[PDB]
Amino acid sequence: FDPAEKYKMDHRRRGIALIFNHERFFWHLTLPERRGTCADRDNLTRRFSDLGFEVKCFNDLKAEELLLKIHEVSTVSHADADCFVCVFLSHGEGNHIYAYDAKIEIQTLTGLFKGDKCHSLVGKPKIFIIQACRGYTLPAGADFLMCYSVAEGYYSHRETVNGSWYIQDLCEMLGKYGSSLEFTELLTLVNRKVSQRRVDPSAIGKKQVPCFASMLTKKLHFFPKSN
Amino acid sequence: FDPAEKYKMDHRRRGIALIFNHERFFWHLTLPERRGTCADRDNLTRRFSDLGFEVKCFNDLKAEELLLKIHEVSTVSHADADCFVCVFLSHGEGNHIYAYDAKIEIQTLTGLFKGDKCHSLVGKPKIFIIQACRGLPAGADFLMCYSVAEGYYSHRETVNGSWYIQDLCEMLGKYGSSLEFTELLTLVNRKVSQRRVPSAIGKKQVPCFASMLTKKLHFFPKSN
Fold first, then answer.
1. Quick one: where's the S-palmitoyl cysteine lipidation (chain B)?
2. Which of A127, A176, B13, B124 qualifies as a FRET site for A100, CA 20 to 30 Å off?
């Protein structure tokens, strides 16, 4: 038995990074919100591409080719891939319908990738990064890693023109440390950075604390892919 | 900014490790269950004591003096301590009342140690290890470790204890004083999920931990 066992990350491809933007049922689209969202998406696209991932982005605005894209990752073979990432982006304060729709969408997404339904990821890291939204975040399975921008209590800073604290901080760590540090050590750095930030704003003293929940059974590294 | 930053674990004392046994409302104390429970309690007492902790055990059978012991950790100062550990032990299948009671108890225990209520643990690791039972919000520097998942599958108690507790304690004993604590928990995920039972029972158990820690955590031998 080996305390330093890590996932085999020597497949032909890194795998897919699905970036899912939750937009339907949102209509307060102020400019900070719209500009922050695309920034977060762009920032994540670059960081994950640089880690070898094949990035696919889509949103839920059109309720017909969403299922397409959905079904479409459902049936994709991951035989030749190291792992799978899914990022769920949403806007900070939403109405109850927008928030309730997120919960169903996350429950659906995670359900698709359970060992029970995706044999080609059995034994491989299934990583979900969830930007939670305020108006059922209980998902799992072996080798899942669930990252949350904020824990169930809590306070999250609003979107800005440059994106959200959690996404910016995550991407900063990915770019600087992604290809070298163990992934959960990296997410721990993200806990610290985010929770250290602060808001003329009108609620001070407040902190956003991110959380990650690991059912991983080995260490996880994203060393540069090939030799 | 330092990728290797770790919690300062150089206080006078390691801190308290509270071992809480959820017993009330359980029916059907079979011998496996009763012997498993004390084994898990003994196993954890030795492992935590060896890591410097001041171990306190109690249960909910009685305790009018439960609140005593409760209030009593509530008001203890942890100024001279590195951290705080609470382990919540329960029996593997229980009735709905027993299970519902475990939820309230866990909500209450965790509630007590929030930065909002325990100033002397602010910025220190607050670690809850929960053996979940069948019929989650914490705070900065909380680490919640779960014998199982959500609802799922968990192996029943044996004479020697539960798989999760045995495997935890084995890792603690061998690696507790050297490895980063979430690395150790990851090893526990593997060990438990690799075990196999038989009747209707062909699956796994997969444990989970959820971290709001902001730094690496080690339990190196405290230098006396």
1. 208
2. A127
